[PDB]
Swiss-Prot record, chain A:
Top-level taxon of the source organism: Eukaryota
GO biological process: cytoplasmic translation; translation
Gene from which this protein is expressed: RPL36A
UniProt key word Cytoplasm: yes
Protein's name according to its UniProt entry: Large ribosomal subunit protein eL42
Curated annotation (Swiss-Prot), chain B:
Encoding gene, per UniProt annotation: RPL21
Gene Ontology BP terms: cytoplasmic translation; translation
Lineage: Eukaryota, Metazoa, Chordata, Craniata, Vertebrata
Family recorded in the similarity comment: Belongs to the eukaryotic ribosomal protein eL21 family.
Protein name listed in UniProt: Large ribosomal subunit protein eL21
Substitution effect: R31Q: In HYPT12; autosomal dominant
UniProtKB/Swiss-Prot annotation, chain D:
UniProt keyword Transport, yes or no: no
Family from the record: Belongs to the universal ribosomal protein uL18 family.
UniProt name for this protein: Large ribosomal subunit protein uL18
Gene name for this UniProt entry: RPL5
Primary site of residence: cytoplasm
Taxonomic lineage from the root: Eukaryota, Metazoa, Chordata, Craniata, Vertebrata
Cross-link position per record: Glycyl lysine isopeptide (Lys-Gly) (interchain with G-Cter in SUMO1): K219
Glycyl lysine isopeptide (Lys-Gly) (interchain with G-Cter in SUMO2) cross-link, renumbered residues: K219
UniProtKB/Swiss-Prot annotation, chain E:
Name the UniProt record assigns to this protein: Ribosomal protein uL16-like
Superkingdom as given in the UniProt entry: Eukaryota
Resulting phenotype, H85P: In SPGF63; reduced protein expression
Source organism of the structure: Homo sapiens
Role of this protein: Testis-specific component of the ribosome, which is required for the transition from prophase to metaphase in male meiosis I. Compensates for the inactivated X-linked RPL10 paralog during spermatogenesis. The ribosome is a large ribonucleoprotein complex responsible for the synthesis of proteins in the cell. The male germ cell-specific ribosome displays a ribosomal polypeptide exit tunnel of distinct size and charge states compared with the classical ribosome.
Family: Belongs to the universal ribosomal protein uL16 family.
SUPFAM superfamilies: Ribosomal protein L16p/L10e
Length: 105, 159, 117, 293, 202
RNA sequence: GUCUACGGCCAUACCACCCUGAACGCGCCCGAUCUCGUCUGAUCUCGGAAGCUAAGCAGGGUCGGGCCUGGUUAGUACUUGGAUGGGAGACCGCCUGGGAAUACCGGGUGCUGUAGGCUU
RNA sequence: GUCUCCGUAGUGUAGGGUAUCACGUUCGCCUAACACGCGAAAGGUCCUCGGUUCGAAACCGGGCGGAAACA
RNA sequence: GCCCGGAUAGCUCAGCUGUAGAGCAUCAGACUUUUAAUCUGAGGGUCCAGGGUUCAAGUCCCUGUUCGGGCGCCA
RNA sequence: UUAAAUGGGUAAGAAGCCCGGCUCGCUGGCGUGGAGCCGGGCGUGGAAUGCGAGUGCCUAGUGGGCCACUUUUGGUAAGCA
RNA sequence: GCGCGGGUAAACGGCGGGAGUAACUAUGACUCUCUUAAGGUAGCCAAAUGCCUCGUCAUCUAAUUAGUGACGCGCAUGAAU
RNA sequence: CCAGGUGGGGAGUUUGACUGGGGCGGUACACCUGUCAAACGGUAACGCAGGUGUCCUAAGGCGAGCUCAGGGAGGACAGAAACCUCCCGUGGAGCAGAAGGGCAAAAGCUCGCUUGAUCUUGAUUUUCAGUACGAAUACAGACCGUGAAAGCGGGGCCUCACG
RNA sequence: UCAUAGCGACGUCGCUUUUUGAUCCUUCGAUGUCGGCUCUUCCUAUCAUUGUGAAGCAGAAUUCACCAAGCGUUGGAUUGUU
């Protein structure tokens, strides 16, 4: 799918529709000091081998896409997360299609 | 085996009658549904919003809630073992007033007027309705016309 | 050809401009339109090959295209079929026929139709 | 005997007939359903529509609300009844549209006992004015406009009857976009060419543009403007008196005309006997005619 | 390769016609349904002989071919090649399936077509002259032997393949309310327009 | 008796052709300066009143087609329940109740609400 | 038995918008003559039947076949 | 998930912010009893697509497309 | 298109019917509308038949089924599925 | 360490296919090419290895799915497996 | 002593299910359409015909304007098909896909503006044990889009497109 | 030559459980499983023999049928083989 790089939508901080700029959200790197990672790392220490399961099935083909949008107001710059359906190909700000066009030459 | 889609088996159920497709007539929108009156659920298939489920088609319920475009209906539904009073939200073009209760209300209004008019007359009038008593022995005239004799046709092989 | 490209170009002319471009087209024929270019609904049409002859003189850039005229006949009251409100048909005997297309032609332009073929 | 006939017997056996008013093309049931249907949790509160219909000779402008049996007209106004006071020439123009809307407003308010309150705008100006309710008084009358099949493009006579109505005191919701004063490119409302059209300067200047150009074009175009001698000037104050006399007495009355007879102007349908006899003699004439040979 | 007809005799499988769902159906063995002087108009062949079957069974498409062939070979032998018109009043639209050589996916592929009949259902129709009744009666009798069930033989009181009785046929066409066309007739009701009426009667 | 505006039911109202229309009206019709639109004032929008029922529209007509409603089909088909009924079966008959649909043959062909016009 | 694949100049081959080439035959050039070579011609209703579509050898349905793979 | 390497006449590869080159190629000429053999010419870049740094990109940088690799792995 | 038989839902009153009156921030041209609330009046108990109903807690065993009329799917058919 | 690069088969293992080509036809000494790198050489065989198969031919017998000898596009023989 | 590699030499363990017996074959293993299905609803088989793990800044949302498939008759090249006109045309087209339903001044096609595919609390339907997910339906509170306005819109005309 | 001495296409009705299927009702705290040898009995859809009828039965040889299972139905090469 194609979605524009900017769109007006409800901004929760200022409580009215404001221009937002969207960008594809990306998962950050693991903290290595979160409680779950701290617990898992302690578990893996010593003998006994691998202690927690490894998924290795991978039935899904695509991913749900999350758009990280923040309001362009300079005073408040709150960033919200909005999700769209599954899509194999995701394009940000692609060129708008036209109907009255020759397809093809 | 068979799926559990919300509109399975409704090929003809929601289909419009013959030569009755098209724009929904307007008078079905300006009918007035109070709270507590009795409605019948049909489910006109033209409108895809606020449809009842196929199990509620052709069921008669009562109204408990009225909103901008729909009404809340308390309709008894029989699950396998028992009957549940289920509430559904249905847009008004899928329902219509019930003439079942309307006929009875006319009778009471005609009946209560009988009650008033009978008292000062001092007579005793009949209030209940009886189940079609026997046929009250009568005479059948002949008018000099003999009831002519009927005889079975002898069989013949048409086709 | 492929779809949605520009193939043809056309216009619609009515009024004085229409009646003079038309006779400008028949004059190419000397008021001649032989047998069956008349359509049974009343209208008719025809095509030509050279446009420099009449009207405007040869322009060097442009080529040698031909084109086609096709007029439509009508009576006051033919507009109700295009009316947005209370649109209707025109009625059987107020319609036009091929027979009264030639008669209108022969009465007005004295053109010669139906060569004996 | 070469091409399949489309409107065969099967075509009619299965053809579905549209709604009657749709067949005559006098009503769109898409907009009417949106425009007529009252919200269900009101149960009797009538949705009032300001119906405006422009005709080749007249302007029909009524206010109604719809029931099961039909739409009920509470009161109506007509451009042909404008000559009863003030304006006598220039019906079915934008100015006449303004007055008949104003006349509709005043006659409903008077019939409603609500004319003394919500006078509207006694002074006519092209700006935006929408009536507001006043506490402790009966609430302002609210109604919506039934444009109908007419194109709602900027500068349409139907929107004249809108401003005419709201000037008389109806609280009709409306943007200031589809008035003649609105400049599409600049997205502004001039509000003075709007009043120029309202009081007839739109045709006044055209009519004052036309004498110096021609007389028989002036004659053939504004013929009924010649009679009654309505000049380019003095077409202002008459509209004022037309607007003023609308306030003074907007009520309507009839002409009792009972001196009529039962002259049927058509023919009653022939009974069955006449049909059966007619084919008999049509047959009888045919056998006679062939026998003569 | 064909199973015995007793295996598919009774109509018990919810008619299964050739359709977009049932693709790959072999061509029925019967392709010609009308034999003889099909040009004979209305009146040269007044007597109409019928073969009516009284069972709710299905007749294989091959059975009617055997029956139709056996009957025409008789008429040309006795009634002449020019003197009869034979019509089979059945069509093999029901499709029978076979599951070949456990029972996983036992739904079998089509291998033949049959025609279902009812208690009153004419199989064969013969229109001939009056003096040919003896031939047509025993011609169909030979055609009976190619059919699984039991079939009765009836001589229709109607005129030929027309649905109207033979006694009142001649006067009806005489009164010009019945007109002849092709192998049958056209009923002319008296509720059209007079122009249709008046083109005839004169 | 009609019509106009807004409608309800949505063909007894539709479709085809022919006849007629008084008065208002509805229309066709004239024109493009303004408003507004199109390649084109054809449509849409606006400004009008010289002409005309020709068309739309209203009414009527057609052994009209459709549609609506009856008869016939027919107590037929079909079907609730019953039998230690018949029949090798396929199926069929009876008892008990309910009960259709073609073809074919008759009748009819818009009713009506609010507001406003005309008709001696 | 089922399944898959294929039926086309004499032979073999490929391939909706009138079947290519090789050899087979005849043939004309070249040569003193043969041989060869080159050239052209002839030659396949495309396995049969039905259907589809403006049109089918080609697409879709049948029937024969022939070869395989399974069974 | 990370580090990445390659993609250009029908086939492969060098390359100049500066007019795309070489070979395997293909057709045609000389060449030659002739074939080889020999040259030579012509045409032919699915420059992997899109952008950008840009005067100026095949290269430089990102985005994807594939092709390939070398590591890592609690839903 | 039409269209049964069998079948499914609702109703057959006192929680109903009819009078008045009050509250509302909802609705609103209006005493509008609607809902709630407060008094009052109505008994011929508003079809047949039968039956005494309402309601709570704890809970075993079972969760391989099979046969018959009739309806019905696959199968040639089956003491088949 | 893995990749990258050399060597290694008396290391494990592998040893197919497609075109064009000789004066009957056939085949292909010869030329080229594909997929992973070669493409079964010398030899041997219906073998303890050959499904079709009781292969075909000769011999042994009156008669031989047996035996022997020969043929080999060998389902699926073969060189320190 | 720690870190990285190699490590079936050795250790522990696992190696789905449904199935006209098991394996091979298929998914009837989560879902959707029509039918089976016996005129409410429900109803099985490795029953029949199919489909899904997507696609879409518009194919979403509003308003406006038009009518579609096909056919007849025409008009230079132009023919069975190019393009223009008239007429007929109940939808015989299109609506992303499977099928069913629904749809005509529509829900289709062409334009204009846009982000209601946003931020929140509950109620309800659907399978249901009246659990959950998913999908959906009527509201209510904000903030908006559109339209002159009534209104309509918190995704796709409805039935699936998911944890 | 002639449908039927002997045959029988297109169709159609059956019987048998000496084939192979389909099913899984009995047996998995076991019914010993292919063939051959040996031995008895039984069936008839009769190969031969008894008694008969029919023929495109001159004789001979043969073929088709009926009552009929009392009697008989072999020795070997190859193969585990049926
Ligand atoms: Mg946490
Ligand atoms: Mg099912
Ligand atoms: Mg299903
Ligand atoms: Mg929706
Ligand atoms: Mg509108
Ligand atoms: Mg057999
Ligand atoms: Mg079955
Ligand atoms: Mg009629
Ligand atoms: Mg009965
Ligand atoms: Mg158990
Ligand atoms: Mg069972
Ligand atoms: Mg070596
Ligand atoms: Mg090995
Ligand atoms: Mg070898
Ligand atoms: Mg060998
Ligand atoms: Mg051996
Ligand atoms: Mg031996
Ligand atoms: Mg040997
Ligand atoms: Mg181990
Ligand atoms: Mg059901
Ligand atoms: Mg049921
Ligand atoms: Mg619209
Ligand atoms: Mg708004
Ligand atoms: Mg809201
Ligand atoms: Mg067993
Ligand atoms: Mg035991
Ligand atoms: Mg055991
Ligand atoms: Mg024992
Ligand atoms: Mg015997
Ligand atoms: Mg003995
Ligand atoms: Zn903000």
């Amino acid at each position: 799918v194609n979605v524009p790089k900017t769109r007006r939508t409800f901004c929760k901080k200022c409580g009215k529709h404001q221009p937002h700029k969207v960008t594809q959200y990306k998962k950050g790197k693991d903290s290595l000091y979160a409680q779950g990672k701290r617990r898992y790392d302690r578990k893996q220490s010593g003998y006994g081998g691998q202690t927690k399961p490894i998924f290795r099935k991978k039935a899904k083909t695509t991913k749900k896409i999350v758009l990280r949008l923040e309001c362009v107001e300079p005073n408040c710059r709150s960033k919200r997360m909005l999700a769209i359906k599954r899509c194999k190909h995701f394009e940000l700000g692609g060129d708008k299609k036209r109907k009255g066009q020759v397809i093809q030459f | 085996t068979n799926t559990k889609g919300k509109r399975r088996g409704t090929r003809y159920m929601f289909s419009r009658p013959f030569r009755k497709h098209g724009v929904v007539p307007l008078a079905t929108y300006m009918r007035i549904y109070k709270k507590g009156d009795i409605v019948d659920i049909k489910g006109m298939g033209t409108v895809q919003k606020g449809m009842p489920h196929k199990c509620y088609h052709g069921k008669t319920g009562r109204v408990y809630n009225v909103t901008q475009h729909a009404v809340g209906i308390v309709v008894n539904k029989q699950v396998k073992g028992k009957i549940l009073a289920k509430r559904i939200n249905v847009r008004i073009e899928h329902i219509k007033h019930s003439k079942s209760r309307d006929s009875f209300l006319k009778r009471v209004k005609e009946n209560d007027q009988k009650k008033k008019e009978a008292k000062e007359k001092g007579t005793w009038v009949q209030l209940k309705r009886q189940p079609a008593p026997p046929r009250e022995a009568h005479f059948v005239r002949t008018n000099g016309k003999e009831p002519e004799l009927l005889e079975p046709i002898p069989y013949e092989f048409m086709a | 050809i492929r779809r949605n490209e520009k193939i043809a170009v056309h216009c619609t002319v009515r009024g004085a401009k229409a009646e003079e471009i038309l006779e400008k087209g028949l004059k190419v024929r000397e008021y001649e339109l032989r047998k069956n270019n008349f359509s049974d609904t009343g209208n008719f049409g025809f095509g030509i090959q050279e446009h420099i002859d009449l009207g405007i003189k040869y322009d060097p850039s442009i080529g040698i295209y031909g084109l086609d005229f096709y007029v439509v006949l009508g009576r006051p009251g033919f507009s109700i079929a295009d009316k947005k409100r209370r649109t209707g048909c025109i009625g059987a005997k107020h319609r036009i026929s091929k027979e009264e297309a030639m008669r209108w032609f022969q009465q007005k332009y004295d053109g010669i139709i139906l060569p004996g073929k | 005997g070469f091409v399949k006939v489309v409107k065969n017997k099967a075509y009619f056996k299965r053809y579905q007939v549209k709604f009657r008013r749709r067949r005559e093309g006098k009503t769109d049931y898409y907009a009417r359903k949106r425009l007529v249907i009252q919200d269900k949790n009101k149960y009797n509160t009538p949705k009032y529509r300001m119906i405006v219909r422009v005709t080749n000779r007249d302007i029909i402008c009524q206010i109604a609300y719809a029931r099961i049996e039909g739409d009920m007209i509470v009161c109506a106004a007509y451009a042909h009844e404008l000559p009863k006071y003030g304006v006598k020439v220039g019906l079915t123009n934008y100015a006449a549209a303004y007055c008949t809307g104003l006349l509709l407003a005043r006659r409903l308010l008077n019939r409603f006992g609500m004319d003394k309150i919500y006078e509207g705008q006694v002074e006519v100006t092209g700006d935006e004015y929408n009536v507001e309710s006043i506490d402790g008084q009966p609430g302002a009358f609210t109604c919506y406009l039934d444009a109908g099949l007419a194109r709602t493009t900027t500068g349409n006579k139907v929107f004249g009857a809108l401003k005419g109505a709201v000037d008389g005191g109806l609280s009709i919701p409306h943007s200031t976009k589809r008035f003649p004063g609105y400049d599409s490119e600049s997205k502004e409302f001039n509000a003075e060419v709007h009043r120029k059209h309202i009081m007839g300067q739109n045709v006044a200047d055209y009519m004052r543009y036309l004498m110096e150009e021609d007389e028989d074009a002036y004659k053939k175009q504004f013929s009924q403007y010649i009679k009654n001698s309505v000049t380019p000037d003095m077409m202002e104050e008459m509209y004022k008196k037309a607007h003023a006399a609308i306030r003074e007495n907007p009520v309507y009355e009839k002409k009792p005309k009972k001196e009529v007879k039962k002259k049927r102007w058509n023919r009653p349908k022939m009974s069955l006997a006449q049909k059966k006899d007619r084919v008999a003699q049509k047959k009888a004439s045919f056998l006679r005619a062939q026998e003569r040979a | 390769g064909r199973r015995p007809a007793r295996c598919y005799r009774y109509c018990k499988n919810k008619p299964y016609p050739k359709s977009r769902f049932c693709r790959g159906v072999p061509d029925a063995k019967i392709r010609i349904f009308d034999l003889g002087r099909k040009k004979a108009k209305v009146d040269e062949f007044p007597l109409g002989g019928h073969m009516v079957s009284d069972e709710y069974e299905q007749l294989s498409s091959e059975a009617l071919e055997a029956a139709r062939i056996c009957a025409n070979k008789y008429m040309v032998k006795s009634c002449g090649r020019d003197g009869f018109h034979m019509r089979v009043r059945l069509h093999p639209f029901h499709v029978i399936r076979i599951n070949k050589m456990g029972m996983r996916g036992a739904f079998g592929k089509p291998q033949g077509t049959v025609a279902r009949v009812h208690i009153g259902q004419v199989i064969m129709s013969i229109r001939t002259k009056l003096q040919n009744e003896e031939h047509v009666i025993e011609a169909l009798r030979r055609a009976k032997f190619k059919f699984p069930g039991r079939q009765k033989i009836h001589i229709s009181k109607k005129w030929g393949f027309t649905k109207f009785n033979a006694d009142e046929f001649e006067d009806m066409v005489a009164k010009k309310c019945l007109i002849p066309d092709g192998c049958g007739v056209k009923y002319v009701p008296s509720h059209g327009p007079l122009d249709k009426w008046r083109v005839l009667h004169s």
